[PDB]
Amino acid sequence: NSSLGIIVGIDDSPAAQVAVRWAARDAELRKIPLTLVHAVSPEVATWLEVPLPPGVLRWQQDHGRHLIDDALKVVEQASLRAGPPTVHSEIVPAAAVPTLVDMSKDAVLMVVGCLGSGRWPGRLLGSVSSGLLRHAHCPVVIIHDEDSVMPHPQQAPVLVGVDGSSASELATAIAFDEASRRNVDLVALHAWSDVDVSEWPGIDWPATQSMAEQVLAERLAGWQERYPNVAITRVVVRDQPARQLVQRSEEAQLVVVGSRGRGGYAGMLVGSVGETVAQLARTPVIVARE
Amino acid sequence: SSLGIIVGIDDSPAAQVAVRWAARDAELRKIPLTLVHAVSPEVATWLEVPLPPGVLRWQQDHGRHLIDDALKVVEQASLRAGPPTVHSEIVPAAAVPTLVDMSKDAVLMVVGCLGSGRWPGRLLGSVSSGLLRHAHCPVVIIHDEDSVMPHPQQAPVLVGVDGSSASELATAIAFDEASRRNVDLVALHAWSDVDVSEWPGIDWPATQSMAEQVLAERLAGWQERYPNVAITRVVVRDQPARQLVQRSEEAQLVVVGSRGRGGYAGMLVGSVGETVAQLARTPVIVARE
Ligand SMILES: Nc1ncnc2c1ncn2[C@@H]1O[C@H](COP(=O)(O)OP(=O)(O)OP(=O)(O)O)[C@@H](O)[C@H]1O
Ligand SMILES: Nc1ncnc2c1ncn2[C@@H]1O[C@H](COP(=O)(O)OP(=O)(O)OP(=O)(O)O)[C@@H](O)[C@H]1O
Ligand SMILES: Nc1ncnc2c1ncn2[C@@H]1O[C@H](COP(=O)(O)OP(=O)(O)OP(=O)(O)O)[C@@H](O)[C@H]1O
Ligand SMILES: Nc1ncnc2c1ncn2[C@@H]1O[C@H](COP(=O)(O)OP(=O)(O)OP(=O)(O)O)[C@@H](O)[C@H]1O
Ligand SMILES: [Mg+2]
Ligand SMILES: [Mg+2]
Ligand SMILES: [Mg+2]
Ligand SMILES: [Mg+2]
């Protein structure tokens, strides 16, 4: 029903804080509810012959309430003026992924930090963001603890990766929708080849590039007509869409990609471009899920 | 298991040391070694134009060169007579679907962590990642700085135990592997899957002692099946992934399950299983049923 509006998962981490800032702005901008969720699993998680103390389950509730507390304070600083219509807040006694995945059935956007409290130097995606990226029933927004969310009005355009797939169409819709609402420009990018064609002999790229830029323009005709107020900038590159998007994300305020594409295989939950852009991009990333 | 040990080949440092490891293991178990390189002969494009038949021939020529190199690496890595059988296949399909299908007849599936498409930042390639989630047998992840050639290698085999059925499989291969290599085994258990540092009123020493007692109990039986492998039990507070990664520096092999006692329905690989696979400092076997 999408009545929950923009859900945002919360924990004790920088990413989650700046994730709230972003989720607040978008909920305000879109004029829809902003749900704040923090999950605490109350299941027995250790060997039964070694139980946990009773004073620990209550401590998590208090910790949780103290988090939501600060979160609600951040929702205020983030608002440009009005703030989102409804401002909803919850501490669910269940595991983070299962609860957030279930709640996404009634959400417009699902927003979480990319790394959480159990992070360390090596990792680049936590279990919550990862599971959400693979199972959510709505677009998932990944925020990094160095993303620029405070500045306004943000002039940086919206970058989107298109590849013709159905999952990519959804991503496009989101990209334009988000672009006009923010009143900024849109950069559509297509890598001719999904496969890395560095050593491929007898290509002749300059010839192929000119032909592609035309087909790109033809596919974006319906979208340009539907969104006359937003200025499209088409870019065709040879290959390596993930690495292309990640580098060009530095000159954009928001990157949008599908969760699937032309390639992949049976049983794949999230594509490698989707996953890689979400991990390495320098700005907020929206991974479109049906 | 007619295919024995399958190793996926591509042009990359990790894939090369993966072949070294696979060869040693296939030799050790005296089972077939199967080298596989997959080339996707089609590149779906918007123009809907097929590939110049000249390019299509080049990648067969490229696969041929990889195999030739790989076959030499196999005999360089063989300590004695090597694997009883060595096979190479060049399959005209995508790597993941190809390898996932072949894993139905493999004892182990060996691939590098990163491939020829690697670039700074990425920890796992699409093939290693897809194999971790989908393979029909245990998957071995090799890193390009993994020590494989030095022999004899007396470092222990490290295994993470959490009590789950998938963890039970991990234990099985950890002992099998340690037994065949004539080395010792370190079984590590983290009492809590989630962080516990800030939790009030624990009493760690008493909880640790009770846990160590249960660990020993579960490992009895394995010990009785494997009298010659000296077990070492380590019980830590929490953070099993970071603990395993840190302790891998002093093992020659780490074994974990693909799933644990946590997770959810639809999860293909646990966060500990994956994090160990990508951050560990030695070969990592991830157990799959
Ligand atoms: N308990 C939770 N409830 C709701 N959302 C959460 C919760 N924990 C984390 N999140 C969200 O997920 C984002 C990433 O946290 P995640 O837990 O996935 O990473 P991590 O803690 O570093 O890794 P891991 O949890 O696997 O040890 C956080 O920034 C936050 O937005
Ligand atoms: N060639 C491309 N050019 C521009 N964007 C792309 C390209 N390929 C994928 N994308 C973006 O990434 C999103 C997810 O596609 P992805 O390729 O990750 O899924 P997939 O093709 O099923 O997986 P894989 O390519 O790893 O086999 C696409 O919907 C699109 O938004
Ligand atoms: N074409 C292939 N055929 C067989 N095995 C492969 C093939 N490509 C990669 N592998 C195996 O997977 C390991 C990791 O490579 P992978 O391709 O997953 O990483 P990458 O190339 O950096 O990622 P990506 O292909 O998604 O850009 C390689 O070391 C190799 O063992
Ligand atoms: N607490 C632990 N102590 C020792 N080993 C562990 C522990 N947790 C996980 N492992 C190792 O990791 C393997 C995979 O389990 P993992 O925890 O990754 O899956 P899961 O619990 O189902 O998923 P998740 O932990 O993210 O909810 C286990 O089989 C075990 O070998
Ligand atoms: Mg966490
Ligand atoms: Mg793709
Ligand atoms: Mg590759
Ligand atoms: Mg676990």
Curated annotation (Swiss-Prot), chain B:
Residue sites binding ATP 2 per the record: 160, 193, 257-263, 271-273
Database matches in SUPFAM superfamilies: Adenine nucleotide alpha hydrolases-like
InterPro entries listed in its UniProt record: Rossmann-like_a/b/a_fold, Universal_stress_UspA, UspA
The entry's keywords: ATP-binding, Nucleotide-binding, Virulence
One protein family per Pfam: Usp
GO MF, one example: ATP binding
UniProt induction comment: A member of the dormancy regulon. Induced in response to reduced oxygen tension (hypoxia) and low levels of nitric oxide (NO).
Superkingdom, natural source: Bacteria
Keyword ATP-binding: yes
Keyword Translocase: no
Residues reported to bind ATP 1: 8, 38, 112-118, 122, 126-127
Family: Belongs to the universal stress protein A family.
Subunit structure: Homodimer.
Function per UniProt: May play a role in the establishment of a persistent infection (latency) in the host.
Protein name, UniProt field: Universal stress protein MT2698
